[PDB]
Amino acid sequence: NIRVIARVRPVTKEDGEGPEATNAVTFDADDDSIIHLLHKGKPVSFELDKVFSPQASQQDVFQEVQALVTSCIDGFNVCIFAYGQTGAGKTYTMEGTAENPGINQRALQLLFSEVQEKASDWEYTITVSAAEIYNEVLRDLLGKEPQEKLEIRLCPDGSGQLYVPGLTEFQVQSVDDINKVFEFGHTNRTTEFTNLNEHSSRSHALLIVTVRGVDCSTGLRTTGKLNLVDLAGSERVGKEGSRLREAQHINKSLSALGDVIAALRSRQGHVPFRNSKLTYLLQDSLSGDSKTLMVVQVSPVEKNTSETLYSLKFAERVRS
Ligand SMILES: Nc1ncnc2c1ncn2[C@@H]1O[C@H](COP(=O)(O)OP(=O)(O)O)[C@@H](O)[C@H]1O
Ligand SMILES: [Mg+2]
Incomplete structure (x- = not known):
């Protein structure tokens, strides 16, 4: 149900030239779950569910998602998280670009095509909301200015579900x-x-x-x-x-x-869902038969090995 993967982005202009841009992340020849970090001259190795290299395309990454997305048609809930330091490629993986669309557009595109294939007795409605959590405050990214602080409430039917x-x-x-x-x-x-x-x-x-x-x-x-x-x-x-x-x-x-x-x-x-607004809001899409994918983004270069180490330790901790 719960899968943890890493994506190593390619070198970017922000990585610079010279020694700071030296490659620090390497791999195993046989096992695509292994990632090797060179950190201050010493090797550290991690095992995840899958590791994507700087050559992995958006389509490659989406192969980890497509089955989760189709299960939503059937009433399953799914969470996909992008995690990692600023600059490591979270937004590129989730939103992508016009030339290289990310998980968000590919997931919705797949939902529309799956709905179009259902029998004529079925009627599907797909809606989107977007919310921001900043310093434990929840606001509507698509709401009318000035956006109020939003509450998370229990459904009054006694189901224990949140809205x-x-x-x-x-x-x-x-x-x-x-x-x-x-x-x-x-x-x-x-x-x-x-x-x-x-x-x-x-x-x-x-x-x-x-x-x-x-x-x-x-x-x-x-x-x-x-x-x-x-x-x-x-x-x-x-x-x-x-x-x-x-x-x-x-x-x-x-x-x-x-x-x-x-x-x-x-x-x-x-x-401990209640310990944070994010986990409390999402608890009905994390528990039970819900499926979760955690995508840990890391930089490949020597300059960032401290944060890469922290990110990969987080990945191993949630795996486990
Ligand atoms: N897999 C990738 N392939 C190519 N470029 C990438 C990739 N991931 C990130 N980048 C580039 O790296 C830079 C930082 O990415 P961004 O998505 O802004 O990171 P974050 O959202 O984690 O701060 C952007 O210029 C983006 O185009
Ligand atoms: Mg971003």
């Missing part, structure tokens, strides 16, 4: 529709009266896709949730006051996410 009053939902039917939603989101982040955080690297951004089906011949209903999560950057911040508090919020929320996934993966009795 977010006032979170906006956009109906989408095509990749062109989702592109229009994403463009609106980008513009909406920096309006004059916004309460959204300008620095995307310091907040968790969640794209919540809801897939609702009804078999119109019987009234049978399915509800699948696909949560596409571009996490705040994990890098350590050297010792603002407000910058430090922000870094501490991020550290505690990411650590809580790791605690929750590790507890779920090991099928321990107590899963």
Whole structure:
């Protein structure tokens, strides 16, 4: 149910030239689950569920996702997380570019094509919401300025399921529709009266896709949730006051996410969902028969081996 993989991005301009850009990440010839880090002259090795090299394409990465996405059609819930330091490629993996679309566009494209193949008795509705978690505050990335703080409430039917009053939902039917939603989101982040955080690297951004089906011949209903999560950057911040508090919020929320996934993966009795807004919000898409994919992004170069080490230790911790 719970899988942890790493993606090593290629060298970027930010990596520079000279000794700092020397390669530090190598691999095993036979086992694609192994990653080797050279850290301050000493080798450290890690085992994950799968490791993607700097040659891995967006399509290669999506092969880890396509089966999860089709299960949402059937009513399963899924979370996909991108984790790692700012600059390691989280947004590239999740959103991609026009020339190289990421997981978000490929997942929605696959949902639309799967829906189009269902029998004529079925009616599917696909909607998207987008939310920001900044310093444990939840706001609607697609909401009207000034965006209020949102509450996470228990459904009043006693099911124990959670909902977010006032979170906006956009109906989408095509990749062109989702592109229009994403463009609106980008513009909406920096309006004059916004309460959204300008620095995307310091907040968790969640794209919540809801897939609702009804078999119109019987009234049978399915509800699948696909949560596409571009996490705040994990890098350590050297010792603002407000910058430090922000870094501490991020550290505690990411650590809580790791605690929750590790507890779920090991099928321990107590899963501490309540310890963070992110894990509490997503608990119905993490527990039970839900499926989770954690994608740990790392830089390949010597300059970043401290943060690569921290990121890969996080990956091994949640695996386990
Ligand atoms: N797999 C990849 N292939 C090519 N370029 C990448 C890849 N991952 C990241 N990049 C590039 O690295 C830079 C930082 O990536 P970004 O997605 O902004 O990282 P993050 O969201 O983790 O801060 C961007 O310029 C992006 O184009
Ligand atoms: Mg980013």
